Amino acid sequence: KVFERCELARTLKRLGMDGYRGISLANWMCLAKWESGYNTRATNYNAGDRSTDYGIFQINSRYWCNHGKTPGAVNACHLSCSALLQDNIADAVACAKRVVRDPQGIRAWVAWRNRCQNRDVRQYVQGCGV
Helix, strand or coil: CCCCHHHHHHHHHHCCCCCCCCHHHHHHHHHHHHHCCCCCCCEEEECCCEEEECCCCCCCCCCCCCCCCCCCCCCCCCCCCCHHHHHCHHHHHCCCCCHCCCCCCCHHHHHHHHHHHCCCHHCCCCCCCC
């Protein structure tokens, strides 16, 4: 499912993302836009990750979710990679919260460092009333 901008902002605010680990809602919105264009069904082979990235947040199956019942999956989020491709993003938010809790924080996403860090994230929550 592809979220309209303000729709997503409200959902993430409802899910406790604004200010989480000190990351404002604007930053999460900027991340989601460049990683997936707000589409829950997005998937890409990430050269950097040497694995496939799943959904709205482009979370990897290398460390965070188990893709295809692999007995040997790290599965830090203890979720099937498919759950991160759903229309209800509660699971994807729970898992992204987990990713930012590790030593790299928001920088764990190269796209954030590349398209959002030290820039105008304000426009993404614009007019949303969030």
